[model samples]
Target chain A: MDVMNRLILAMDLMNRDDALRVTGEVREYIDTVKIGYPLVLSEGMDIIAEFRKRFGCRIIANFKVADIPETNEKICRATFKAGADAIIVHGFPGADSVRACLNVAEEMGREVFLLTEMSHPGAEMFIQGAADEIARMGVDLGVKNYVGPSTRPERLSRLREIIGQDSFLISPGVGAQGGDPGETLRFADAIIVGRSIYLADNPAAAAAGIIESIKDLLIPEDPAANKARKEAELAAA
Target chain B: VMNRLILAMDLMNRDDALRVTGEVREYIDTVKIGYPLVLSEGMDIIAEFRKRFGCRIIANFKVADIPETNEKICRATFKAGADAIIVHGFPGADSVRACLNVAEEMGREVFLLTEMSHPGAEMFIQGAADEIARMGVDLGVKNYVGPSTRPERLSRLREIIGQDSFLISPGVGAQGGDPGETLRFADAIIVGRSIYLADNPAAAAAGIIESI
Candidate 1:
């Protein structure tokens, strides 16, 4: 649930050898890995357990599960059974389908991240139009986490507003998709970085550099800083 | 991509799924397999079905993701030996196009799922179903999946995609869709529980074929 360093690795590589080596290279910088169909389909579900055993980090099955409630439940159950800490599901399938994943997550003590808006150019066509209502539906259904596009911060901010500040939100489309990490982290709880990190000459530095850019804002808030903020506002007055 | 009847082998277990599909293989030349069985068994199940029954396997993954992930899913699915893979159009053209791209590279096919055959589909999918179908056409997609439960909507989708594009509709049998009536618009009707759950799956498939 808590992403280490506010960075989650979107490992989309298709092979086990390169995927493991690249992930191992940047292991210190990331504590949560979002493994999707790319690797799962190539290497199979065992890859989820492999990642956990090798890195001891949380694995979020980014399957983008979209189906009838019956099938959705099966996917969620199997995903969690394979050792995923959380799973991403699509909200466009409506309340019942989303609810099915939520139920499975609840029973298994895992988390479900509802995908509200995608971070793709074509998302503006149909998903962008319905993203707001979909977010509202997720909220009504007691969803605690969501996925929004980092490529568009305005929509991400709107999604944040809809799901409220308490809900955990993760945004993809950073790096390769042209989303600024500093700007994306404003609304998204964590930023999902893929190609920029994995495809980098040095994944650790790529991750470190991205984190360095946002280091000023990533500091742990201090009671003194809060008091200082109040004093500054009062002094300015 | 299918005969008049496509078996929706949704059973989660490998034994029942394979046995029932094998039982009804005589009536159906294609099987629409989804995440239920794939996740339950494995991706190799696709090759297994092809080897055992020698039937075409449509990976009904209902893939809805960003273009990048969609590409990988489609590639893996085709590599696993699926004749075609089903994708959701609601994620928009980019995602569908990504699937189409992998399908093209692999020399397979992509079936754009315009609308679903479930009750919850009416909530959001119904509103965009027609436009989604049109988007599929705009992107040069020729295969589609619509709902058999609603004949009017199915006809509307057929009208949008036109006569030549292949269309398959599910929701037959257990979901209260008629096989004969569904075939009026859909090139094939996807029957799941009615055939797979039947005591005599071969007999059920035969009766449905005879009725059509």
Candidate 2:
């Protein structure tokens, strides 16, 4: 689950034309796009297929699914049917709800990114207290992808320590949210950047600038070596 | 905010959902549409309900996301003609506030979901339900959703949100909740399976309304 260039464009733009145009501009710097409710709801689910056909990028439907198991399963099925590569889901609804999304994703041969904690000021109230337990739950359920916060580096590092090095971790809160790109990469496999790039004067240059700042830390890993280490870690676990 | 009977349209298909909802349109002036229907039919269903019944639509999305994402979800929901949207308070202040901001800008409403009715809600959600309700008040939230299965918890939530705030309760009928008892605490009761799956949805809804 390697994110090309370690940068995922969080395309939160509501309009279809602007979303596609901005994404096309930064297409060279990103291979994955985190499309949330704003774009999906405004442009429709068909937008997922449009992004795939036009840019050939992996679409992570950042829906932040939170509901009962029955409703969660339906949402996951609909998202996967629309051609999403992966779907982001909430973990606070307890294991049953998360398992529902996992079941649908597994059946459809897609992936689920467990959101252990959110990168927002209000998240500290309840989610922060439950985040550690949530991360542990994700590991127990054999989840392989996770979403942590770049806004809080200490918390992000702690999450990485909980989920371990083998699982893929993506962090949001970069640029406009005040998360440093280099610091976020210390634990996150990819940094989800939204406003800073999409709202920029030149979206492509903005992406290029962020990558340049983190170039020293952007060391490419050998796929064979990475797979071998993961297999060894799985055996040990 | 409602007529004391809000229809919880949780059916998964379009034809059945519309047929059942139409049958009870006279009994319920507001409909709570969850992901079960929206995902199966599409967001356009909200506008369709608005056009067909001329009733208020509450998008029970249970939105829980980061502030940036929360804002966008709320925007899309309102743009699709939702009168109000339900948000998860456990996500904390920033996330909840994001929804409130969008609701304000769009002239829509946001209902903070304090506790769920299901059995599994006892795990982590129950522990945080009280504090979450308090947080909603602190943030100046005026509407909320509480479980009808637990009357005492519902009463406690009412005490927290106060008598002035609009409160809706689910878990009635099929979930073993009595409509009359739920209405004592909630401004309106949300009923899904018992009415929608009944041999006659209109009669089932009218019966509950008369009993309450």
Candidate 3:
């Protein structure tokens, strides 16, 4: 799960032509393509399968699943089974969604990234109070990934502190949302780049440009230094 | 627009969805299909349900993303035969606006998620419920979805969202929400497993619809 590229391409495009077109160009630069509602609704599971067949890259389903116990399981299993390396689930639905999804993640051998904080201005008004608790709850339920927003630098750093360095903090809002890797790199394990890549003049060049900007930021941190900090955080958790 | 009893067809497969929706089609006005079924059976199921049940279907994906992509998803859902779709407030106004725009352009409907039915919904949806409600109104939204399981919250939402926008309540029946109390607050009631679980889903749905 060691991500070579700090850049995670947000393939939030509308159609198959645009998705494969851009992904074909940016495949080398992006470690994974974060597929959201647009493509999933348009192409269904075939898109996920197609991506794997065409490029052999990791696919992340930005499902943001928010529902009851049974639904959480169905959505999670379907996404992973469709060839997603990981799938995102909403933390707002509480234990049933998380607990039920945990079974599927285990059953399917896929990763779960709990969406605790979103990378949007509207989120600031509504999503702050519950993220910390949701992050901890996710950890207890055996989730090792959490989605944080680069738009909120300080909060993102604190989230990383809470979720542990062993856990991955996938941060969005890098390009069109006015976030830079320099600030996000302080906390985010990976940054999700969308329009800056998909809608660019040259998708490959755009993704390569993002990777170049973040390459220096991905210095090998001394694991020895952060072990105690993360241990204390987990012990308290 | 006379959505009285909205049936949530959150079933395991296309056959179950088609069979149950057919059973309760008489009593149910709107069929709210969650993302799970769509992901499991695909959009063909949406067409299948429409051919079988002949009712308005709500594709409840809670579409959350940037505006550009959000609009595309909205178009896709409508193309799939969804009369309406649900989009989340968590991704900010731009995303919601995209969903709103596409829905309007396509002559399809959009429901803004203000709050949810589960216990954990309050923690996420409560803090910004008022802001989301006002936003929905400002953008000229005619419909909204809130956690009908809580009467007071539903009533509060009714006050904030105003009378122009009718509300759809989803967390009723098997989710520990009362139809009668929720009816006092909401414009429409959405029941899921409670109806489909019974030996006679039509009778169960009929009984619940009559209670309102």
* Residue pairs in clash, model 2: A122-B93, A122-B94
How far residue A65's Cα lies from its native spot in candidate 2, in Å, is 0.6
Q: Taking the candidates in order, what DockQ does each have?
A: 0.79, 0.71, 0.51
RMSD over all Cα atoms, model 3: 3.5
In model 3, which residue pairs have backbone atoms overlapping below 3 Å?
none
lDDT of 1 by residue, B1-212 (tens): 44688888989888888888878877889998888888777899999999999999999998888787888888889989999999999988888888998898889999999999888898899999999999999999999999989999999999999999999998898888888788899998888888887899999999999998
Alpha carbon deviation, residue B194, candidate 3 (Å): 1.5
Summarize candidate 1's per-residue lDDT along A26-81 as a digit string, tens digits.
99888999998888888888899999999999999999999988788989998999
TM-score against native, each model: 0.94, 0.92, 0.89
lDDT of 3 by residue, A1-237 (tens): 645576788887878998899989987766688888778787777799999999888889887777767777778877887899988888876776777877888888888889988877666655666788888888878788889888887777778877777887788888898876777766666788888888899888888777778766544435544345445544453
Going through the candidates in the order shown, the clash numbers are 0, 2, 0
Model 3 accuracy (lDDT, Cα): 0.79
- Tens digit per residue, CA lDDT, model 2, A104-212: 9888999999998888888788988999999998999889999998888778878877898789999998988788666667677789999999999999999999888
Model 3 DockQ vs. reference:
0.51
- The candidate maximizing TM-score is 1
Window of ten residues with lowest summed lDDT in model 2 chain A: A228-237
Model 1 - which docking category? medium
Which ranges of candidate 1 are over 4 A from the true structure?
A219-237
